[PDB]
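Q: A reviewer asked whether we had any structural model of the full assembly, not just the individual parts. We don't, so I'm hoping you can provide one. Inputs are below.
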Amino acid sequence: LGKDHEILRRRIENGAKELWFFLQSELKKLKNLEGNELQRHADEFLLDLGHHERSIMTDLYYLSQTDGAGDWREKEAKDLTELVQRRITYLQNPKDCSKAKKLVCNINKGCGYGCQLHHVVYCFMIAYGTQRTLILESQNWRYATGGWETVFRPVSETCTDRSGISTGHWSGEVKDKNVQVVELPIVDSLHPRPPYLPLAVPEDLADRLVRVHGDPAVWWVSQFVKYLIRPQPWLEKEIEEATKKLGFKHPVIGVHVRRTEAAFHPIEEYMVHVEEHFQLLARRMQVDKKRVYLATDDPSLLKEAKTKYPNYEFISDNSISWSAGLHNRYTENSLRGVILDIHFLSQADFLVCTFSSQVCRVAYEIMQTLHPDASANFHSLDDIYYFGGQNAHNQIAIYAHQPRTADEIPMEPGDIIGVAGNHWDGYSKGVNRKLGRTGLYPSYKVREKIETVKYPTYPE
Amino acid sequence: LGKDHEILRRRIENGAKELWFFLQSELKKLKNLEGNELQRHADEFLLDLGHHERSIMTDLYYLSQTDGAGDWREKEAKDLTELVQRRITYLQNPKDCSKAKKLVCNINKGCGYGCQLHHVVYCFMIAYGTQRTLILESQNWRYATGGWETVFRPVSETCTDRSGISTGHWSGEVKDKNVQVVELPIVDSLHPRPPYLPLAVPEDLADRLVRVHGDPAVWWVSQFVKYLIRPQPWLEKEIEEATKKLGFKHPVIGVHVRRTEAAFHPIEEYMVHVEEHFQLLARRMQVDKKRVYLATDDPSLLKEAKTKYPNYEFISDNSISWSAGLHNRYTENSLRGVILDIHFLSQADFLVCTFSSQVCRVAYEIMQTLHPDASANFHSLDDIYYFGGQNAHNQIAIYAHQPRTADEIPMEPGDIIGVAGNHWDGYSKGVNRKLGRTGLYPSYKVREKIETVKYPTYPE
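A: Here is a predicted structure for the entire assembly that you could use as a starting point for your response.
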């Protein structure tokens, strides 16, 4: 047992006791207060709780690193990656291309860059699940006409061709048992659905993942994003100098505002969490200058942000073409900015965005491959992580709830709870499957139900 | 790295995030509320926070046991005990009694049972520190006239005699270098003070202790209480049947009310913490019937308690003499009840009392020898643990404080803070030694400064 581990463990425990004492004390003061006075007292109270909880989180952070835990987690994540990539790399590059089981994916889905990327990932997952080499059809692609491989490595080194002895539309793995080249439609209408969809995870990989990762579901998706998104050497060198040119430097927080009464929306709502996290980082390292990478479809916002937060240094893709003239010929450059935004977002120490946005989900999924466990490394102003087309996202009720209003669901330990969302206010919304009722419950009383599937193992 | 360890660690971390979300949310609701309505909302809020923090504490508890941590802690505590006791046992029983370095302690100090017991412990600590066999003078002892050894084992098996070639009053270890039998006065006036006092701890034992124990200071004191308090076989058998007769059965909470505007005092104030802990225990085991051992100098209270808390089963030393008539001749039986109260208190799963009370401090010190780490296993309505005559109890400021009123002290990380007390409300009172100022600070912003002394090691 580690010295620091036990010190940290008790300081966490005593930090929460102290918090709880301070809580009931100052809460009993608030009961005897009147408008004006009650205001000042509640904000000071909040101020003070802020720092207090930050001290608990900081201890939890230190605890996650002590007996070489940090190093172990790093070697173990690095490990599972090298593993899953080898497996992918294997499947992708067979010897006899002409005779190899294939699954065919078409890129040009009627939707934005992130949306298409996920469609490939989705084809990719099912390929891997079904033991077929992914073949990627990217001809006349809105972003780079000239093919996917004008921007990123080919998805194969030894089998990029569509051909084969027979060719069906997807009709179920067992039925296509014997079709050498299956053609896969978009998820939206896929009408024998295969088990290989999010948010499940390979049965053979689960123990290891749960041990290393806050959300194996996203970690799994991120393996396919990882393989795909390998850059052509020109893309690499453009990234490096945009890094230089824009000044992008750690520590940085990614903010992504997807635009055109209401509020999960105005800039302040984003910057609330940026400040909180920056405060938190300041407990464990010196923050020289507070850095944000702002990604928006709105040029008016970067001027406003700089005004409202003169504390903060904002950094943005302002670039009006690639670094070398040559390259604007490769890409129809709404794509330049999207590649760079996603890059720099995924690269940041923390990410504040709106998960209902494809782009932000890509940034987060990439992020997962940049650290041992960056599952908790975001704040989204609406959705929890999801993947378009996933099977139902289910939770397990861990403690009893008795509703205090009828807008809330009851539950019992064990209850399967279909979660629609978290409200970032102590409450989540979802369905009590046992009861066929939908309402609020407190987010703490429930626990993530991890889904697994018997994927092919590929022993090489 | 353990599977459960990492699950628990993240659930602790996510439990506090959820708490913090719920906090700022419901706190912003409270700002817009008016008397009547504001009341109901604050109490429901408190109700709900209660359970929420209990879920965090319960996880911390489970975390303290996972990768065999519980077993390890148990073997390691058991170990240090066997060690320190061997060392004590050695020193206490030399071969040549007539020629052995001795230190002489007189029991009949002008104060109650606990008070005298600590005086012995104090002589005992200094004996051990100075490499002298403790000789205990207990002739005409208010509690058992006939000697200490009428109730407890002799403090030695082979050297109970006062004699020797020379005999001084304590005058400093280096000066008494050569006096074979030193005579030690009460602490209150001890005028070359030796390093061997609470709340310091043996330098050779510290790493191990901090690893295993929430408060090595009390653990250390408890080693001497342990050796002392070994019972004569008759005492043992009386305890066993009083256990039977009174129904004393786990789980039980010790409550001790030392009596004869104000309130750290009425029974409700005690039972608030009893309920809270019972609630907490109910998260990790089934509570059949909620059991309290009430120890009071007030016979009117046991009737009242039973009335006010019909939920609870109360258990008390009602006995009007020992089990076997014979034994009332051994002891002047204000002592029967004190031995039993202390016993049953020290034996409980949790202890609510008033630390300004000698008896309760003995119960707590004994408790430390009944489990791997029961340092956090109490709630005192006034003092923190102390030992009468200890050197100054010092803390180290761990985070910055800027005072919001002038009744509060500022501090900087590093500041040595002489702690007078904790107010059990998020705040502690003490002195900023750097600043020679005394006021309140938040209990979380500071950290226990562990004191160590180069004790004799006794390699046997």
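A: Points you may want to mention in the reply: Residues 1-67 of chain B form a domain with the Helix Hairpins fold (CATH 1.10.287.1060). The two ends of chain B are 39 Å apart (CA to CA).
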